[PDB]
Amino acid sequence: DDRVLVTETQVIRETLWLLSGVKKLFIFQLIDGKVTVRNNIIVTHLTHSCLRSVLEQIAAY
Amino acid sequence: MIHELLLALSGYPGSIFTWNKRSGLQVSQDFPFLHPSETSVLNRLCRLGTDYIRFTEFIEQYTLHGIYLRAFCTGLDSV
């Protein structure tokens, strides 16, 4: 399975945009009025799953 | 690009910010130098520019006649 391997600081900038209320973001791609995390996001650390966990909470916001 | 935008929000369209007679101000397409996520906020920002252009075009055209229409545009520039 392939993954994009985004850097670290890029996530915070994306998170700020989600807080701003902007749409069409490389992360948190909504489908039916419900924001949802992508599936190929991974950092050097955090074993590809905790990232899906931490983002899932911010997504709820 | 900043001073480029601050003119597009003034009523002067260019290559980066094309102008369409029906839809309004909007970004042409993806640009390599900038990020692909900004292509949205600008489109959200142009929804304001389209208003000022369609405002000032009507203000100049004065269009219908009557003093109460002249004064309305005269005041419309004050706000």
Q: Is B26 on the interface with A (CB under 8 A)?
A: no
Q: Is A25 on the interface with B (CB under 8 A)?
A: yes
Q: Is A10 on the interface with B (CB under 8 A)?
A: no
Take residue B79 and report the two structure tokens written for it. Answer: 């706000």
Instruction: Give φ, ψ of B76 to 5 degrees.
Output: -60, -25
What is the residue type of A19? L
Question: A24 vs B37: CB contact, 8 Å cut-off?
Answer: yes
Way it was determined:
cryo-EM
What is the residue type of B34? L
